[PDB]
Amino acid sequence: NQSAAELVKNLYNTAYKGEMPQQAQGLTINKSTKGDVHAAFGEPERPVGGDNRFDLYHWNMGQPGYGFSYHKDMTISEIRYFGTGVERQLNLGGVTPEVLQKQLGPVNRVLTVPFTDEIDYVYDTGRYELHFVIGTDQTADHVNLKAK
Template identity: 35%
Template sequence: MLNKSKQSYKLAAKLALTGLLAVSSMTALSHSNVHAAAASASAGKNAQNDYIKSIYKLASEGKIPGLNAIAGKTPISAVHYKWGEPDVGGDLKGNHYEGYNLGMGKGEYSFGVNKSGVIYDLRNFGTSIDRTGGVKSLTFASVIKSLGTPKEVRFTGKDKIYVYHPSKAYELKFVGPSKVAKGKIAHIDHINVYAGKANT
């Protein structure tokens, strides 16, 4: 009987120890999950901040992400050569816009073209398929956090436009809705790099 009692005691001690280890493992696991989630959120915010700053740097050179074109310098014929005829606006004369939707997560782009055939406005609409990255993931708040308050805010139709001046030659515009439903966050619809001197 004494032997059985010792065995029961040992079994109970093992079970208690196992339970204690399981609880402490779960606690450690939940702490590591919290830390991982916090690190992931922090990394996401840092990545978004870096992305916005890279947009600004490219804009200072007259460029936008995803394109080799330079506003005010690249002829639209170079885009036609690379991507073919545009989905919208290819048969227009004078100052006009041409648009390309490259499809399935590859993005949508638009070009303001002057009467000489030089691109004066580059637009990147990002992709509508994955809004967790790229242009569509940005908000006006994230832009301000990365670049500071814009020197100019414009309103056109239903759009609000934050205007930055990364260089004398170019304007960088973050365009999104001027109003959103209560409880919603206004995400950026597209970005522009505009070369005003080329818009002739």
């Protein structure tokens, strides 16, 4: 499951830039805007509105799902990586709290998630932090990137 390992490694790496890899490349926390996100990804499959504070982009084939929340000034406040639906084992489906240990060493923090039964393994990445949100089964549901 080296695909999931290389993923965790690539996520940890780009997190120091305040970006996520692949399709989300060059969209920087507190720097890139809602406008840049829309320019890159098109219109969301579920946009900001109501109890939803994320521009949501559904996973499509091998292309993963993403969520973008913004500050008042319209710059990115958080990036949420959802993995894919098809062959999920190759990404977040294969991301366990143990592969996080084998790849990134010990975790900085373990935090509670409000309104859910998930556990968040936090890795500090310079000015930013990577929140690996693991579900009831030992697999990742989504990975969050935000400023420290």
